[PDB]
Amino acid sequence: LSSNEIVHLKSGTENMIKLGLPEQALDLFLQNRSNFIQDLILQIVDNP
Amino acid sequence: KFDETIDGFKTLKFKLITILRFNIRALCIYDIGSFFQNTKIWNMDVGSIELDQNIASLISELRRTESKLKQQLPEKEKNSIFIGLDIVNNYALIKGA
Amino acid sequence: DDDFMPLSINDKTLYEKVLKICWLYPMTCTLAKKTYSKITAFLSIFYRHELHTLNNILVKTMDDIFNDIVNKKIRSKLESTSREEIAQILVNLDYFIIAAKEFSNFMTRENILQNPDMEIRLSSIK
Numbered sequence A: 001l002s003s004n005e006i007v008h009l010k011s012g013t014e015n016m017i018k019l020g021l022p023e024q025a026l027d028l029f030l031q032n033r034s035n036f037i038q039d040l041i042l043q044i045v046d047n048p
Numbered sequence B: 001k002f003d004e005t006i007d008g009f010k011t012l013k014f015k016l017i018t019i020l021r022f023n024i025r026a027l028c029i030y031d032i033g034s035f036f037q038n039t040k041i042w043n044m045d046v047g048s049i050e051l052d053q054n055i056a057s058l059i060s061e062l063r064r065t066e067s068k069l070k071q072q073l074p075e076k077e078k079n080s081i082f083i084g085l086d087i088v089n090n091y092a093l094i095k096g097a
Numbered sequence C: 001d002d003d004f005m006p007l008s009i010n011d012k013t014l015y016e017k018v019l020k021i022c023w024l025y026p027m028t029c030t031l032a033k034k035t036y037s038k039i040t041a042f043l044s045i046f047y048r049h050e051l052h053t054l055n056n057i058l059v060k061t062m063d064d065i066f067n068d069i070v071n072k073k074i075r076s077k078l079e080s081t082s083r084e085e086i087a088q089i090l091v092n093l094d095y096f097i098i099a100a101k102e103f104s105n106f107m108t109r110e111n112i113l114q115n116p117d118m119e120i121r122l123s124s125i126k
Helices: A007-019 A022-041 B002-034 B053-072 B075-096 C015-021 C028-042 C058-064 C070-079 C098-103
Strands: none
Touching: A007 A022, B002 B053, B002 B075, B053 B075, C015 C028, C028 C098
């Protein structure tokens, strides 16, 4: 829930699968890309 | 415990009060982009396109300010402080403007 | 550069290149079109100073850096009291005043293109 990169995200994602908590894992991942895109919108209407 | 939770309520109204004053004074600050807007013209300056950049800054940090304020705190207070202070200071901002 | 004469009609090789220069008389509009097109062409030093308020008042800095704000043309041409192409060189400055209108027509400008509502420049053209 903190890294803007890919490698830890990729890695600990498949480590979370390696625990076998994949559904929670995917949901957190999608939440990270949600927050990601969310904050990517924070760079700027100037004109439509 | 009523003096206690009373005082915590007083800190709540003080704090949310301070946030609403912060956003509102950010606006009234931001209207001074008109001061000066470099001689808002006489009868024309045609053209006359756009767009008084300080006001775009006001839209910008207003927008991000509401972004992070929607991130941290709860919804109802944000709608409250932002709603009342924003619309009212918009109106009187035009008035003294 | 001198011998203020009309444009020699070579008939016809660089006449299309003269038409790009037109965006006659010998040299002033003929070379100065390449000068200013070279200038604002060179003044596109952005596409890497973008994601900030460079789109703000630095645009007005580009406004002050006009077709070098035309007194640089309009001192020496203002100074040159010479009967050779007198007002015929300035027919390429009434016609380079039509290139001043081309410069205020060189107006799909910046902020990337916003607000497309005015881009006029005609102070030094006046």
